């Protein structure tokens, strides 16, 4: 059981919760397979073949849009997500604001970079991403940044220890929690995130404000810039995430 | 009026086995894999690879499923690394802290291939 | 002067009109300049330098979104657009339905291809595009598809000469018409387009439903496919626009 | 506070003249232009071209505009041809029906450079 | 006759198929071979160095995880495989029909241990 | 003392500057030289096969289109240059300070003459 859920008396604080979410995702997946074939018709058939080998979509997420249903089908990293483990259904993770979504995305760019014993050659990766927004509403929600649970915010926002939040996630899952907000562990402005246990949290049928982004990942920073309109880059140094010269991960 | 002009005689219906064979050989070349390295991932001999160009790779086979997973590895790597070929190849042939070792060596076995693919899927935004 | 505008006496048919528009545009412009420099910070400065050499935006289009103001700043092709000539302010051309916008876009893909006396060596151009929607509402509108103006539809939708529609465009512009609809000359479904003389036609200041598209242009067809979700290509054969052999242009 | 100091330690304030000089030389490379073809488009000699790496290209000068127009030509060609370099090179070195002739030959003169650029801007669905 | 790796793997996967109540067609779809080739494992063996051998080994590990989790109740192991699971995306036996689902079922069983 | 191609182009630019009432700085920004080079055109000339000569020829063609459009009436040629225009994106003389604007003003005047 979760000590944080036994304390705080979590069941007493379950209440309806609403809001919007922002999520930054990669594009170029379809561009990738278009390089393997000759025609768009061959690429469409290949994408159908690739779909058949993927983990199945949970039955309740199938009628959703592709960008809303996909997070529910794949397992997380082997060390689990912050509030979910490899053996439980994956959660839909997003941020409440765009700048928090970029911080979480920049951190996992550093995670990919730091996994390789030898850093990527040329010391720069130019990739393309897309952000979208969506409304969510649940009748059984929890605010982990709220006074009852914020007494454990140090253990909930730990940079390289998932045990306490992962046990809290299983305890909320069994208690019927449908979605919950929490303090981001990576956002330097202390923005809040939101996680959805069930695809029924989504109010709308289609993701909104789809925006392409250009991403630049180096050994020292991750930068984001709109791909379709004039803008200035938003820079995320590795110093936002490094602890003792090393990138933390569980 | 004239919607039939493009509703037909411009749309082709390609074979699934020929598309899979074409895609897995192109993924082999882009990732810089040899024929024997490809043979060890999907589990065939180099002679059977030479039949894919004339016969195709049957999708209903376990050989084809492993080829689908291999293409998804290229597909995730391309999106993660922006299509930069030298970085995608570097990832496969460099020891990795998060994986059990060098990804290309891991993909030589079934459980390692799934391990590499699941890592690349989960580290993507869209998870 | 336009005598088709005189036979119809269109000044009496100027009436308020609302509606939606959909428009297919290119992306990868910002990706292009990112290849020339080393950082996103340098790319943002380069894009500012390139802006200073562009034709200035009309003052009323300045507060609009980048995708809404840009068509008003560049001159058309030197043989003019269908309702506007090289020496006149540019018009905002869009379609009423997405299928018509793809047909118009597919035609100008063939126009670019046909300009080269020898086709490009790759035999196939893979480009990235984006579609967006916008609401438009004008107090002074005209429907060239209406029966009063539909009696000249053979001259207004002619495939290879702009003389009659261009004179009609200058007549509507001088008569105070802010926007007008007309029959598309390229859409196989006989969809309708819409043209805006003024940026004040837009109801909102932002585009809606930005959607990325994969485009495949060959010597035989143009195919479009969503770049972010699974889908089947919408193919437009060159024969939809070729007349007696080769593509016509005025 | 953490974001403020982190951005301040890595913030880059690039030079306009140095950025333009780097951009036009990179555009010259990708478009396959010789040192003399570039010199005839922007209107300098080859000594001033190599001198750009030490000084940059003065943006507020008339040479800067021609270089800015040249970058915009590469920019529109990239978007129209999906970054396929040899198709972009093909367009510039192939006689064109809609233009007065070979675009690269037209771009050797200021009136032809504007004509090539205005054509590429107008044929974009961006307009 | 001398013991061999191919005979050892064949005996193990055939013993797992027996206890789990899997038919030849169900086993054929999990290891990716035809129903006729299953009958040849007894006399000859199953190639350990093959992809079919790697998947057969994964299936044995699934049976070993089911045996340890249900204490050897053969009837409970068969009920787990053919009943839609609340925590999983579908029926475990159906998930094991694909490569990634076969690994996922093993990952799920090892964690609940 | 006897004609050259650079000398005739010079006078055409100098005469167009006097006729249109352009300042030495406005002329310098259109053809892309410094103000010291303006005075050196009368003692030598303007190189026809140069970017400055190309821009100078286009500016001189603009004075031509203005002369034919206004019948030689000098004040309306000057008034057209310094008055904000509907069909142009701004003031014509301000547009002529840039390369694409100089071509744009010439194309507009050529179509309406």
Numbering used by the authors:
A (entry chain C), C (entry chain F): 1 to 250
B (entry chain A), D (entry chain D): -4 to 122
E (entry chain B), F (entry chain E): 7 to 119
Paper text:
Here, we show that the NatR–NatT TA system, which is part of the core genome of the human pathogen Pseudomonas aeruginosa, generates drug-tolerant persisters by specifically depleting nicotinamide dinucleotides. We show that NatT is an NAD phosphorylase, which leads to the depletion of both NAD and NADP in a subpopulation of cells. NatT function is tightly controlled by NatR, which is both an anti-toxin and an auxiliary factor required for toxin stability. NatT belongs to a subgroup of RES domain proteins that have adopted a Flap region mediating its interaction with the anti-toxin NatR.
To elucidate the molecular details of NatT activity and its control by NatR, we solved the crystal structure of the NatR–NatT complex. NatR–NatT adopts a hexameric structure with two central NatT molecules flanked by two dimers of NatR (NatR’ and NatR”). NatT is composed of a peripheral ring of α-helices and two central β-sheets that form a cavity. Although NatT is structurally similar to other RES domain proteins it harbors an additional helix–loop–helix domain (hereafter referred to as ‘Flap’), which provides most of the interaction surface between NatT and NatR’ (C and EV3B–D). The Flap contains several conserved negative charges (E26, D38, E42, and E47), which form electrostatic interactions with positive residues in helices α1, α4, and α7 of NatR’. For example, E29 of NatT forms an electrostatic interaction with R119, the last but two amino acids of the C-terminal helix α7 of NatR’. Moreover, a well-defined tetrahedral atomic density modeled as a phosphate molecule was found in the interface between the Flap and NatR’, in close vicinity of residue E29 (E and EV3B). Residues R82, Y108, Y162, and R186 coordinate a second phosphate molecule in the active site of NatT, positioned next to the nicotinamide group of NAD+, that likely participates directly in the cleavage of NAD+. In the NatR–NatT complex, the C-terminal helix α7 of NatR’ extends all the way into the substrate-binding cavity of NatT, indicating that NatR’ controls toxin activity by blocking substrate access and that dynamic repositioning of α7 and NatR’ is likely required to activate NatT. Of note, the Flap is tightly sandwiched between NatR’ and the adjacent NatT protomer, restricting Flap movement and keeping the active site pocket occluded by the C-terminus of NatR’.
